[PDB]
Amino acid sequence: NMASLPATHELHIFGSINGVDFDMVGQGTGNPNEGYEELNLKSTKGDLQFSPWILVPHVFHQYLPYPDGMSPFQAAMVDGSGYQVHRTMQFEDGASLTVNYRYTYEGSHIKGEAQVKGTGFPADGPVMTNSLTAVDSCWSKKTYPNDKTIISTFKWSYTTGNGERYRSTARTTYTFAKPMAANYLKNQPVYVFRKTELKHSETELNFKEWQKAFTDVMGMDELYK
């Protein structure tokens, strides 16, 4: 018997921000019945030369349960066929950031690879000058346009060192190797509430996340934003 939800994970998150290369690796844990995950990361390329906050929320929906059972992400892991993830973020100042994810599974252990490319950050904005201080909690909205796709959308805000909000919008595409169960396509959309904590230096990140999915939710349209 090999049927397993995740208990542990590791992330290799790498790429560039405004052409500057970064690379971080580390181990983490979570509880796939509660939606909790935490992750340690260490840089393999010296001091991050940009706000470490730009890697949140990108630093494993395999830990997210749904209101009534496994999420489609968990079902894809357990079945073994899995899924791929593409995220785009559009920032208020015209900057753009993409992340592509691939996973492999060794029983209850996940190996994540996340490739990041951020461009168009103003040279003196809060990202390149390292003056982001916090994130807002966040609702995501998950839709299923077909049986192999989930589209997720969210508004995102960082706090800056002057106490302003620095805003973006995010679109995430999930591609499933096997069709999702009919029940998922019927009980949509799904809203997920997420809270995060980040402790960081120049070279190290300690990330935590709490998340909970909500189904059958009326007039959530202008409130999740």
Author numbering: 9 to 67, 71 to 236
Paper excerpt:
mNeonGreen, an engineered green fluorescent protein (GFP) derived from lancelet, is one of the most brightly fluorescent homologs of Aequorea victoria jellyfish GFP (avGFP) yet reported. However, we were ultimately successful in creating a variant, designated as NeonCyan1, with a tryptophan-derived cyan fluorescent protein (CFP)-type chromophore, and two additional mutants with distinct spectral hues. NeonCyan1 has the ‘double humped’ excitation and emission spectra that are characteristic of FPs with Trp-derived chromophores in the neutral state, such as mTurquoise2 and mCerulean3. To obtain insight into the molecular basis of the empirically determined biophysical and photophysical properties of NeonCyan1 and its variants, we determined the crystal structure of NeonCyan0.95 at close to physiological pH (pH 7.5), NeonCyan0.95 at acidic pH (pH 5.6), and NeonCyan1-T207D at close to physiological pH (pH 6.5).
In addition to obtaining the structure of NeonCyan0.95 at physiological pH, we also obtained the structure of NeonCyan0.95 at an acidic pH (estimated to be ~5.6) which is below the apparent pKa of NeonCyan1 (6.4). The most notable differences between two structures are the different configurations of the chromophore, which is in a Z,Z configuration at physiological pH and Z,E configuration at acidic pH, the presence of a sulfate ion bound in close proximity to the chromophore at acidic pH, and a partial deformation of β-strands 10 and 11. Absorbance spectra of the NeonCyan1 variants in the presence and absence of sulfate ion, at pH 4 and 7.4, did not reveal any substantial effect on the absorption profile. Relative to the Z,Z chromophore stereoisomer in NeonCyan0.95 at pH 7.5, the chromophore of NeonCyan0.95 at pH 5.6 was revealed to be flipped to the Z,E stereoisomer. At acidic pH, the distance to the nitrogen atom of the imidazolinone ring has increased to 3.34 +/− 0.16 Å, which indicates a weaker hydrogen bond and may even be consistent with Glu222 being deprotonated. Associated with this weaker interaction is an outward movement of β-strand 11, which contains Glu220, and β-strand 10. This conformational change may help to sterically accommodate the Z,E stereoisomer of the chromophore. Similarly, the crystal structure of NeonCyan0.95 at pH 5.6 revealed that the chromophore is in the Z,E configuration. This observation supports the conclusion that the NeonCyan1 structure can accommodate the Z,E stereoisomer.
